[PDB]
Enzyme design. Structure first.
Site, mmCIF file in Angstrom:
data_model
loop_
_atom_site.group_PDB
_atom_site.id
_atom_site.type_symbol
_atom_site.label_atom_id
_atom_site.label_comp_id
_atom_site.label_asym_id
_atom_site.label_seq_id
_atom_site.Cartn_x
_atom_site.Cartn_y
_atom_site.Cartn_z
ATOM 1 N N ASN A 186 0.807 -1.232 0.000
ATOM 2 C CA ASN A 186 0.000 0.000 0.000
ATOM 3 C C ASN A 186 0.848 1.295 0.000
ATOM 4 O O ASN A 186 0.303 2.388 0.148
ATOM 5 C CB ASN A 186 -1.009 -0.015 1.153
ATOM 6 C CG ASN A 186 -1.784 -1.319 1.247
ATOM 7 O OD1 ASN A 186 -1.788 -1.990 2.285
ATOM 8 N ND2 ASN A 186 -2.426 -1.733 0.149
ATOM 9 N N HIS A 217 3.175 2.279 2.162
ATOM 10 C CA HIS A 217 3.456 2.798 3.489
ATOM 11 C C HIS A 217 4.703 2.081 4.004
ATOM 12 O O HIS A 217 4.921 0.913 3.678
ATOM 13 C CB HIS A 217 2.271 2.555 4.439
ATOM 14 C CG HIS A 217 1.039 3.293 4.033
ATOM 15 N ND1 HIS A 217 0.809 4.595 4.441
ATOM 16 C CD2 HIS A 217 0.024 2.901 3.230
ATOM 17 C CE1 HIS A 217 -0.332 4.957 3.873
ATOM 18 N NE2 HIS A 217 -0.840 3.971 3.132
ATOM 19 N N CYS A 247 6.243 7.359 8.926
ATOM 20 C CA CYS A 247 7.277 7.988 8.119
ATOM 21 C C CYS A 247 6.848 7.905 6.653
ATOM 22 O O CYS A 247 6.400 6.853 6.189
ATOM 23 C CB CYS A 247 8.633 7.325 8.357
ATOM 24 S SG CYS A 247 9.957 7.878 7.241
#
Ligand SMILES: COc1ccnc(N2CCNCC2)n1
Ligand SMILES: COc1ccnc(N2CCNCC2)n1
Lengths: 264, 265
Positions: free
Chosen positions: A186, A188, A223
């Site tokens: 995804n 991330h 992050c």
């Protein structure tokens, strides 16, 4: 892998790979953390999931990791089979808990254990929510109803408050950036990357002479693919360390944690 | 995994993991490169290695990768079983070659193939050398004697000369450093990290709209744990071709050069 007879937990065997081991010819703690994540995804799929639980998809809700605690007694060597048993549990409206037990497939002995706390979040606004019923009823059909805790002990390492590292840090690794391999499907940053980034500020002399016994990690903010991270460490003592990951620019806190190491 | 009936090649099935896939829910080329490396290590162990021979250990010699070429037709999806067959071959005194065929375990069709050239090097001086006679006989007992090539073709992309990228580069990714996960059990940077670092300068728009079909990579020098790398790219072309160069951030010392070919999804 497969669910247990009662359908309330899941088991999986993994053969330790050549590129998964460190200088001691045993799996790194990041390899362990990837295997926990993998058995967790297979458990979720075997009981009919996407992470989302139908009512989370209708509300644009996701689970995010708040805490990850891992205690290893023996690291499996390259070529060994490790068996991991995982299960979930509701914690009222606070969130969800996922636990793991690691065993040597040959001896059947426990070689490590882990626990993780997940909080509810709207994927659009990024706002933390409390578990608003429904989700709690659908989680009850796949979870043990009596408490099953990998860390049962009253007053244990997995539930302790973690303080904030004070400047100046004793050790540091500055300018850490995620690359495409650090991102999940995804886009991330993988929760295991944070563990690696935390360990980057531990001196190579400590790594070469000690073994990581415990690691506890708090997750405060994610992050981004284009964010730069600074990893800070201080000895608080066996060897104990206090850790802090923050954004290189503004100094925004992304993670805080502690590690315990024993001499080899 | 296990050696084939004749004992001249090795096979292994791998189930694709959740963290091993990209945005398309299929294995990344770095996952493929790690699986090739893994089946290669198990092949070496099954025929009595640990990946030095008896003669190499006596002389302090190791095998280093000179080239890695990978052509993928279909990336296995998350949850699929992929079967990889590997084998080695002697290339006279030049070095050795390791070849791989990737297949879908369900359909039995070839979904990718790879080839790699290895050169002999003294572990201490770091000086390359031609393969001695003792080493050529020691692995001739584990290799097919008639040629067996994953890339047989008259003029295949696996044997093409790669030019040097000219400054200025069209695209770049600066300040790449290896972390502990990038190191192998001997504390040297994993060959797969270089592939990832090469792909870091490819624009995210190309990744999002195209699939990596071919990658060829030349290895000239190893990157140290405390070295910083710059990744440079230039388009050389419905298909997209790129020229790549990895160099040390400081002095600009060349560590890698390569090319990639991509097709629209
Ligand atoms: C509770 O732990 C976490 C972990 C990751 N992200 C977050 N939020 C916090 C609220 N803003 C968005 C990011 N919380
Ligand atoms: C031909 O492939 C490679 C790969 C890595 N290192 C090297 N050498 C070249 C000689 N100096 C030491 C480093 N060669």
């Amino acid at each position: 892998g497969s669910l247990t007879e009662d359908g309330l937990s899941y088991k999986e065997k993994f053969v330790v790979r050549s590129y998964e081991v460190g200088s001691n010819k045993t799996a790194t703690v990041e390899t362990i953390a990837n295997l926990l994540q993998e058995v967790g995804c297979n458990h979720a799929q075997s009981v009919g999931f996407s992470a989302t639980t139908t009512t989370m998809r209708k509300l644009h809700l996701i689970w995010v990791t708040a805490r990850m605690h891992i205690e290893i007694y023996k690291y499996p060597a390259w070529g060994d089979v490790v068996e991991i048993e995982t299960w979930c549990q509701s914690e009222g409206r606070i969130g969800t808990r996922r636990d793991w037990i690691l065993k040597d497939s040959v001896t059947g002995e426990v070689t490590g254990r882990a626990t993780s706390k997940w909080v509810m979040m709207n994927q659009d606004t990024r706002r933390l929510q409390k578990v608003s019923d429904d989700v709690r009823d659908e989680y009850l059909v796949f979870c043990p109803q009596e408490p099953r805790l990998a860390f049962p002990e009253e007053n244990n390492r997995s539930l302790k408050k973690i303080p904030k590292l004070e400047d100046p840090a004793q050790y540091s690794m500055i300018g850490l950036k995620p690359r495409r391999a650090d991102l999940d499907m995804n886009q991330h940053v993988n929760n295991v990357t944070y563990i690696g980034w935390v360990l980057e500020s531990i001196p190579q002399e400590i790594v070469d002479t000690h073994e990581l016994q415990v690691i506890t990690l708090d997750y405060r903010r994610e992050c981004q693919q284009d964010d730069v991270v600074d990893s800070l460490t201080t000895t608080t003592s066996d060897s104990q360390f206090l850790h802090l990951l923050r954004l290189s620019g503004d100094g925004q806190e992304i993670n805080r944690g502690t590690t315990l190491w024993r001499k080899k």
